Amino acid sequence: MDHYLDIRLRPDPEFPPAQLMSVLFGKLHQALVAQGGDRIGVSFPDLDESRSRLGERLRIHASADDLRALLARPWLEGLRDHLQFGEPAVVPHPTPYRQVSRVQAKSNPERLRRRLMRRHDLSEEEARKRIPDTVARALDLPFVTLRSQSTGQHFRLFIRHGPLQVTAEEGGFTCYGLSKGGFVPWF
RNA sequence: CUAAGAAAUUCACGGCGGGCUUGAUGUCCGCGUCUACCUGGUUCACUGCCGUAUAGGCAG
Numbered sequence: 001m002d003h004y005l006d007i008r009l010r011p012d013p014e015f016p017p018a019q020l021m022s023v024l025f026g027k028l029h030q031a032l033v034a035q036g037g038d039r040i041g042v043s044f045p046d047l048d049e050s051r052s053r054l055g056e057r058l059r060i061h062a063s064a065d066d067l068r069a070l071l072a073r074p075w076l077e078g079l080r081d082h083l084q085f086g087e088p089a090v091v092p093h094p095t096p097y098r099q100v101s102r103v104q105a106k107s108n109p110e111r112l113r114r115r116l117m118r119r120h121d122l123s124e125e126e127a128r129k130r131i132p133d134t135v136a137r138a139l140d141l142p143f144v145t146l147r148s149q150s151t152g153q154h155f156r157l158f159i160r161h162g163p164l165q166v167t168a169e170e171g172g173f174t175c176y177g178l179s180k181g182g183f184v185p186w187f
Numbered sequence: 188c189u190a191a192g193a194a195a196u197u198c199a200c201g202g203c204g205g206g207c208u209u210g211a212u213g214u215c216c217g218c219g220u221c222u223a224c225c226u227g228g229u230u231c232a233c234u235g236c237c238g239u240a241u242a243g244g245c246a247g
Contacts, residue, residue: 013225014227016227018226018228019228020227021227023227023229026247028247029247033244033247103243104243105243106241106245108232108233108241108245108247109239109241111235111236113239115237116240117239128239130239131238132239135239136232136233137232139241141241145229146247147247148233148247149234149246150229150231150233151229151230151233152229152230153229155229155247174243175243175244175247
């Protein structure tokens, strides 16, 4: 939008696709989760759904000051020695449809869905008939894993973004702040 | 377009009485199993969820 950023994670053993570098792709958004910051546009610049990975670099869409000096949260650590590092730049001057990043798009509703199936004062024999498992179905959400209390290794993810605009502006805010609808950088 | 072409074996029955298998025995003796290794390929496509409705500070 106003200042699009990137973060290069270098290749190594510890950043392979198993659990040292698989789970740090859709759950490591501590700059928009824990390290400080909540009003950015999530726009991953590696949206290639063939490998099920909607982001290659650490693509983030922010403003001019938020990309130049207002993006110093702890959500960019590990790239000091175990990877490379990025910096801020200008926003998309052309019309890039980069309204897709790590956002609140995901289909893991079976983690707590017994209240929507059989926790409504009934027994447990209606966990798929009254309220089905159709929302707790894993699908091809192109997005890196997550490292929360769901497995010792990484997890699943998704891309909660859509189209992008033609001007320079941060779009709408989802759970991950995925800046869909705003003209972020296309890649 | 075939060693082609076709076809109901059925009904009924008491197997049964008896038995001492015993005696004795030295398995001995000897040995090098070593050498290396990422389980971070999710132990529920998940552990709690507002409406099963890709609805999330989702605890990611």
